[PDB]
Amino acid sequence: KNIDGYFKIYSKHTPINLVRDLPQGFSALEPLVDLPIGINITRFQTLLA
Amino acid sequence: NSNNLDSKVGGNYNYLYRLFRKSNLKPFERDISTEIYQAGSTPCNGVEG
């Protein structure tokens, strides 16, 4: 998220046992990273190996 | 006041401001874009108009 020039990154890692589906369950996100840049972002891409 | 600090006798033209812009801006936002503002309804391209 990016509010008032603050980019917020909320994250979680979980060990799972599932092949092609998104797991049915509940999991809160701890707030982890905030970064005060101040830019207008419109598009985004991932990067693989 | 900062008259004796940076103002030059030839006119300190290092100090600029954005006068012509189509819309008022969101708080804590900056713009360094220098694109020519069509103050008339006639669209204009190139280097002036």
Distances in whole angstroms, Cα of residue B23 to Cα of each of A5, A7, A26, A41, B37: 20, 25, 43, 19, 11
Kindly list the distances between the CA atom of residue B32 and the CA atoms of A10, A11, B21, in Å, as whole numbers in the listed order. 31, 34, 12
The residue in chain B having the minimum alpha-carbon distance to the alpha carbon of residue A4 is: B28
Contact between A4 and B30 using a beta-carbon 8 Å cutoff: no
Method of elucidation = cryo-EM
Q: How far is A28 from chain B (nearest CA, A)?
A: 31
- Chain B hits for A38, CB-CB cut-off 8 Å, are 28-30
Cα(A35)–Cα(A8) distance, integer angstroms: 7
- Residues contacting residue B5 through CB under 8 Å, at least 6 positions apart: none
What SS3 class is residue B1? Answer: coil
Q: Could you identify the residue written with the tokens 């401001």? A: B17
Q: Resolution of the deposited coordinates, in angstroms?
A: 3.9
Phi, psi of A8 (to 5 degrees): -115, 130
- Tokens in use for B35? 């694109």
Q: Which residue of B has its CA nearest to A5?
A: B28
Short-list A4, A9, A3, CA closest to A32: A9
Selected for mutation to probe chain A from B23, B25, B28 (highest A CB count within 10 Å) is: B28
The Cα B40–Cα B49 span in angstroms is 10
In this structure, what is the dihedral angle of CA atoms B38, B39, B43, B46, given to the nearest 10 degrees? -40
**DSSP structure string for A1-49:** -EETTEEEEEE-------SSS---S----EEEEEE--------------
Report residue A4 as tokens: 């008032």
Report how far Cα A45 is from the mean position of its chain's Cα atoms: 13
